Amino acid sequence: DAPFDAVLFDLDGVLVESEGIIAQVWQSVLAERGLHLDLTEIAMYFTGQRFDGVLAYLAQQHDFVPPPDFLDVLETRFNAAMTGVTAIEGAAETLRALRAAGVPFAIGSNSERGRLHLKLRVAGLTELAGEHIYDPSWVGGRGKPHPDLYTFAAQQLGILPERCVVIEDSVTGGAAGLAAGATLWGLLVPGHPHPDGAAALSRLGAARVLTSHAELRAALAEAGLLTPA
């Protein structure tokens, strides 16, 4: 009984750390303008939100309306900041282990193509991540939670999606993996923000919810993909 042929990876929160970096930018730019919010609130409510929706949040929850230069200063600083994206601990080790064992894998991300590649570059993961790196431009813009990216990535590997395991840290991405017919394993490495938590991923239908790359590697071995410690 060997359930999987291949692994499909999310990028943000799973292979690279960028949402923590984004949260810190929000935090410092607001702080400079009077408002001091904690990193957990900013990650929870600012990330992946449209600028006008962040403004609405600030006005409703914090009675706060930012100065005229808010939009210009955040863009400067979100720019300067993408260069500091870093590899999730143990991510390179997982990619290295899968390459050594000849297990096919792909990356699916909603990031614009150049930003996807920039993040793998700055995180030192380009060579490990390989050829199968897919953003929504490959599927006509139909990104997660649509299953399209993962269906396509499986197809590019020549593996049936039902025989893939998807490694994700959000409902948006986990949903895309389940809707493609894959098995979902949530990965929530602590000390980095994720858009959703363990209970939401399990209720969504994650078969398990892992908390480190070391844990992931053990699970992949139980599943017959890697060699057990």
Site for Cl ion in 83-112 (CB under 5 A): 87, 91-92, 109-111
Known binding residue 168? Answer is yes
Q: How many CA atoms lie within 13 A of 61 on its CB side?
A: 13
In this chain, which of 11, 106, 201, 219 binds Cl ion, going by CB under 5 A?
Answer: 11
In the complex with Mg ion, the residue whose CB is nearer, 13 or 143, is 13
Least Å distance, CB 142 to Cl ion, is: 13
- Beta strands 164-168 and 6-10: pairing type? parallel
In the complex with Mg ion, the residue whose CB is nearer, 58 or 196, is 196
Q: Which two tokens stand for residue 89?
A: 């601990």
In the complex with Cl ion, the residue whose CB is nearer, 27 or 47, is 47
Euclidean distance between CA atoms 73 and 195, whole angstroms: 25
Per residue in 155-169, is it b (16+ CB within 10 Å) or e — as a string?
eebebebebbbbbbb
Least Å distance, CB 13 to Mg ion, is: 4
In this chain, which of 4, 7, 8, 12 binds Cl ion, going by CB under 5 A?
Answer: 12
Binding site for Mg ion (CB under 5 A): 10, 12-13, 169-170
169 binds, among Cl ion, Mg ion, none (CB under 5 to 8 A by kind): Mg ion
13 binds, among Mg ion, Cl ion, none (CB under 5 to 8 A by kind): Mg ion
CB 195 within 8 A of CB 169: yes
Q: How many CA atoms lie within 13 A of 224 on its CB side?
A: 8
Least Å distance, CB 171 to Cl ion, is: 11
CB 184 within 8 A of CB 10: no
Nearest CA to 26 among 62, 15, 11, 10? Answer: 62
50: Cβ–Cβ under 8 A, 6 or more apart, which residues?
none
In the complex with Cl ion, the residue whose CB is nearer, 12 or 30, is 12
Known binding residue 10? Answer is yes
Binding-site sequence positions for Mg(2+): 10, 12, 168-169
Binding-site sequence positions: 10, 12, 168-169
Q: List contacts with Cl ion (CB under 5 A).
A: 11-12, 87, 91-92, 109-111
